[PDB]
Nucleic acid binder design. Structure first.
Lengths: 206, 109, 48, 107, 151, 68, 138
RNA sequence: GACGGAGGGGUACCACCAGACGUGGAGUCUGCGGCUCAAUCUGACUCAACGCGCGCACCUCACCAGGCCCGGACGCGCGGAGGACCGACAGCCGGGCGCGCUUUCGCGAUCGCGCGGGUGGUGGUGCAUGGCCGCUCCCAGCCCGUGGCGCGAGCCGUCUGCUCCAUUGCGACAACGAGCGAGACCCCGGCCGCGGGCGCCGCGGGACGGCCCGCGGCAGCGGGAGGACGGCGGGGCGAUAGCAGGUCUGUGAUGCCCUCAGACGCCCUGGGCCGCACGCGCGCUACACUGGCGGGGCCAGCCGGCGCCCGCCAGGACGCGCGGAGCCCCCGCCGUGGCCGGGACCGCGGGCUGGAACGCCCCCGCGCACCAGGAAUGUCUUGUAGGCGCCCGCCCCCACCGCG
């Protein structure tokens, strides 16, 4: 027979919302660092964050002053006692392969005057360079005439329907807003590079 | 408006102490978090909610702070030149106490 | 206007992500919105 | 030392991540008497919602459940000593770990 | 009320060597068996009185088909919890019939007793694979949907 | 009704011509070991290993008598 | 074998006679103007209903023994549905105080004994019911 | 390509067999047109509008009848510090607060006022769009590199054959070599091992058209045995291409647009969403004896707090950590009588939750239709239909729904 109050089972939920709130602040202020994912490691109420970034020094910038204002902004926001919050950013190898970095690197060219097909193939170049099986860039919105539509530019085979899809493929959606209207851009990258699983279709023989 | 003078000094020093003022964004009267210190001479606890918010737009437009509202809570941060504005108006002659806590050591993940 | 502002006190639930005054969904104290939930649930962690 | 039992509770949602933590936690029991694992009855907080952002379309419901898992061990060793044992346990991220004294009721 | 650590807790054993289990539609009948005096107090209620009278013959069927030659002088304490009023009764039959075949199982009498078991029901020998089904996202029930609108 | 998927049929052919002697006409399990024996072949998941194994036992029958 | 060998419900009528016969408890005079439950709109018409209820109360308590069984748990063992409302029927509780009168009076008769949480069947109670086990099987 | 009241082949209870459970007829519920209002907020109309945008006394609230106050930030030009402006009791007034009015007391630049630039705005256009679901699509199709073929659109591969849940395979094969989708995969279950236990929970196996016989180049089938399971077990994702499908009313989604101080800001008070001749879509409960009805005996699972006096009860007081459903079934009652079926309305009360009943609960009455349903349709193959209950979504309170 057991007591069911289990008081502690809500704190990991608050931590789950925190990871969410941490993602929403990070993709707002750490886009030039290529922010991908953030982690929460509090065991003794010791806050630890591992931001994933294309290059990590990009996050620290100036002897960690840039990080610390935002480290104690995180503390202030989450009622975390100041200085308990600590962020050790990790550097991302194969920066282009990660989807969130790639979709952002497109919004960065598109918000100016770069062509769509030119930057679609520019983004595709990074995924082939990063050993992705394929990269697909789907831009949507008011391209050309006011009546909107989408251009899908895929190089290399890409999968997206199945359980492998949520084990090998990765993706992100950047809602870029331009001068005429909202032209959301979304780039998916299929990578069979993951060593956590092998496609159950793939077979190797003597 | 006609808010008390103490709040202007209270937010500046707190904004510099944490080098940020993420603010609960509430247009409803209720507990006012962050600047619990509004000096004394009238209060020994937090000031009116409206005062920080109305001041925050004034600071953001002038450029003393930069704001990136995310979820309901605001994510206000003291800007690079804010350090000069805050330090000069508080009459601090030299660079005072901000927020850095050394450099983190490699973590398990 | 000391008396007039917010004379009324009422439960003011809000989607924390959305600020919605409707579809709060506070099943476990969470305020992820009926609609805002799928978009943010992936980081929070929820599975089909 | 105060040889007071500390009940071990690990709240981790990823059954596999928490599985890695269990094997290391049991290992440090060679240092101080680990108890046999008491994995939790699965708790599946459940949220089911209409998929459509608007009300249009046939009602379609997306079923969302995440199983937070608690792992239970019981360890009796010095109160200061248990904190050192946790140095050995792997600090893989996003797990809540607590140790609580099973004190003889103060009497 | 089923698949519990305390499926049988009070028993201290003391000669209940044959331990059986009955699963008949999300219901468990756990029967420790001793070579006693034919006392089958399933749920501490003598087999002679059961809640559904018409269905007593079904519970008597394992004991009657097998016969008193092995059944007499054998006592099984069955605990039944989980499931419903008559689902439990089938679980009780599963426990009783598995047990008497399992008191002489090493001896070849298993083949003759299994023959008595399979002529009656293969379900007495093998557990029921039938449980319950998931409700639809639209309408109520696994196999039923809301009456349609126009068309 | 059962018909094998192309992935199973293709790999099975390789496993029947890689080793006919090692595989067995009716013993599915002997073939199952050869199907998942690391260097000899790898089938991700037991069900797929089972799928190839059923065919490689039928293919073993085919190779034994008048091979296709 | 006190209630196990006998049908406990068959014992319920025999000890219902024994409750008035041995003078255990009394009919509380509210046995004429009150109904058994909010679910059971029908008024009990047996006139010996409080004696069968005070035979049920001890049978429930006897098997559970010192399981700290409280008044509500006894009352919610004869719960029925509420009809007469077009809304689909749902199970509703029996009157807790009619049952509470039974147990509080039974405390004096020593078939009910004070304990942590709910009351239990007293050792004296364990003896009285035992006699009717022989009476029922003989 | 789309259609064919054109063949030849497929196919599924979103079709029909064979059947069952229904609805429509009847009370009531919840919406939807219509009516009326001061307002009865709005989208949404075959499927793919109509218990849909997740329980409307207030908030919500978008609507109406009023009433306050700017929170007009930032510059520029100016005005101004015993003072720019902000407040204020006495009475009146307006439900009402100095809200205005008499009256004269405060108050500290936090600014007054324009000039540009504003916070906004469930204000409009989904026919400016992003996203995100619906539906085509319980259907297997989609395409690619190189080479054929024609000036080319566009074919070939992508096949009448031969199987399948399936472009699932097979065999042929100006095509040859791929791939995405399908299947796999994944999620609970069946069983069976072990590790390991505050809760039964972690990890493996096993089922494979494998094995038997027929008939088949082949694909496979069809009858078998064993077996937890027999040839997807209800299990979730979502090919390609889209549709003026919906939503600016889910947001610091967003274009334009529109308003911006007597605000479409924001707070407040009261009301309306439900008023509601009428038609309609899910629904609930009826029409009783295979049944209402006196207790007794219960027996769960998503999985659960329980206890003492006060009360028929609803409910309270005082407490502490604690402990499971109806259906059915055993025995009474009543006798096919609108009946004791049935509970719809209606009058006194007892309540609770709540600032505030109008909401809901209880009890003593009161006993509407309704006796089995016209045209017309809907849903399904085993733990299924039905039959019966249980938690939760949403909630100060409040399931005839929704997911289970």
């Amino acid at each position: 027979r057991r007591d069911e109050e289990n008081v502690y089972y809500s704190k990991y939920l608050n931590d789950c919302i925190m990871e969410a709130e941490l993602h929403e602040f990070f993709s707002r202020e750490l886009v030039d660092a290529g922010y991908a994912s953030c982690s929460l490691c509090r065991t003794i109420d010791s806050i630890c964050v591992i931001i994933q970034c294309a290059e990590p020094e990009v996050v620290m910038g100036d002897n960690h002053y840039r990080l610390h204002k935002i480290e104690y902004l995180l503390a202030g926001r989450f009622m975390c006692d100041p200085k308990n919050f600590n962020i050790w950013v990790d550097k991302i190898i194969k920066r282009g392969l990660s989807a969130e970095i790639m979709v952002d690197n497109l919004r960065a060219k598109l918000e100016e005057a770069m062509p769509i097909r030119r930057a679609a193939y520019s983004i595709i170049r990074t995924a082939m360079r990063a050993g992705a099986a394929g990269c697909e860039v789907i831009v949507a919105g008011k391209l050309r005439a006011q009546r909107a539509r989408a251009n899908k530019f895929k190089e290399g085979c890409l999968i997206s329907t199945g359980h492998p899809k949520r084990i090998f493929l990765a993706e992100a959606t950047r809602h870029i807003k331009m001068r005429q209207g909202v032209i959301g851009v979304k780039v998916r990258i299929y990578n069979p590079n993951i060593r956590g699983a092998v496609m159950p279709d793939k077979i190797e023989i003597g | 408006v006609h808010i008390p003078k103490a709040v202007y000094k209270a937010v500046y020093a707190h904004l510099y102490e944490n080098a940020s003022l993420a603010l609960k964004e509430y247009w409803r009267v209720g507990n006012v978090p962050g600047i619990t210190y509004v000096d004394e001479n009238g209060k020994l606890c937090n000031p009116t909610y409206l005062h920080v918010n109305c001041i925050m737009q004034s600071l953001e437009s002038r450029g003393v702070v930069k704001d990136t509202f995310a979820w309901r809570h605001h994510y206000y941060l003291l800007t690079e030149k804010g350090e000069q504005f805050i330090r000069k108006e508080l009459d601090l002659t030299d660079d005072v106490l901000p927020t850095p806590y050394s450099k983190p050591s490699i973590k398990p993940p | 206007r000391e008396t007039e502002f917010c004379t009324h006190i009422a439960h003011k639930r809000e989607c924390r992500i959305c600020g919605n005054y409707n579809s709060v969904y506070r099943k476990y104290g969470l305020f992820i919105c009926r609609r805002c939930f799928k978009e943010n649930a992936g980081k929070i962690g929820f599975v089909k | 030392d105060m040889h007071q039992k500390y009940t071990i509770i690990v709240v981790g949602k990823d059954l596999k991540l928490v599985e890695r933590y269990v094997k290391s936690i049991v290992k440090e029991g060679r240092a101080f008497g680990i108890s046999g694992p008491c994995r939790a009855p699965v708790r599946r907080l459940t949220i089911t919602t209409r998929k459509s952002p608007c009300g249009e379309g046939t009602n379609t419901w997306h079923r969302f459940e995440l199983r937070m898992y608690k792992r239970t061990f019981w360890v009796t060793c010095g109160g200061n000593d248990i904190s050192t044992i946790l140095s050995k346990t792997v600090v893989i991220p996003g797990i809540q770990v607590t140790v609580e004294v099973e004190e003889p009721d103060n009497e | 009320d089923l698949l519990e650590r305390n499926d049988i807790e009070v028993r201290e054993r003391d000669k209940y060597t044959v331990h059986t289990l009955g699963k008949k539609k999300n219901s468990v009948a756990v029967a420790f068996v001793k070579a006693g005096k034919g006392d089958i107090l399933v749920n501490n209620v003598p087999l002679a009185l059961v809640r559904p009278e018409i269905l007593r013959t079904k519970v008597s069927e394992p004991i009657m088909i097998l016969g008193e030659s092995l059944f007499k002088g054998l006592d099984m304490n069955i605990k039944v919890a989980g499931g419903g009023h008559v689902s439990q009764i089938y679980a009780v039959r599963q426990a009783i019939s598995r047990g008497v075949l399992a008191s002489v199982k090493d001896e070849a009498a298993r083949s003759e007793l299994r023959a008595k078991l399979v002529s009656y029901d293969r379900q007495l020998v093998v557990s029921d694979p039938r449980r319950c089904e998931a409700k639809k996202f639209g309408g109520r029930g696994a196999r039923a949907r809301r009456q349609k609108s126009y068309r | 009704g059962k018909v094998r998927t192309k992935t199973i049929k293709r790999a099975a052919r390789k496993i029947v011509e890689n080793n006919y002697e090692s595989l067995k006409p009716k013993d599915f399990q002997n073939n199952k070991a050869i199907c998942s024996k690391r260097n000899v072949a790898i089938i991700p998941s037991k069900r797929l290993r089972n799928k190839v194994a059923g065919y490689v036992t039928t293919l073993m029958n085919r190779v034994v008598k008048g091979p296709v | 074998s006190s209630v196990t060998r006998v049908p406990a419900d068959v014992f319920i009528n025999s000890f219902a006679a024994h409750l008035k016969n041995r003078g255990i408890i009394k009919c509380p005079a509210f046995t004429d103007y009150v109904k058994t439950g909010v679910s059971r709109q029908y008024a009990p018409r047996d006139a010996d209903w409080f004696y069968i209820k005070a035979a049920s109360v001890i049978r429930h308590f006897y098997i559970s023994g010192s399981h700290s069984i409280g008044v509500a748990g006894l009352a919610r063992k004869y719960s029925s549905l509420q009809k007469g409302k077009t809304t689909p029927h749902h199970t509703k509780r029996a009157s807790c105080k009619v049952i509470r009168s039974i147990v509080s009076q039974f405390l004096g008769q020593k078939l009910l004994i004070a304990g942590e949480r709910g009351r239990h069947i007293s050792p004296n109670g364990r003896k009285m019911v035992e006699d009717f086990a022989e009476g029922l099987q003989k």
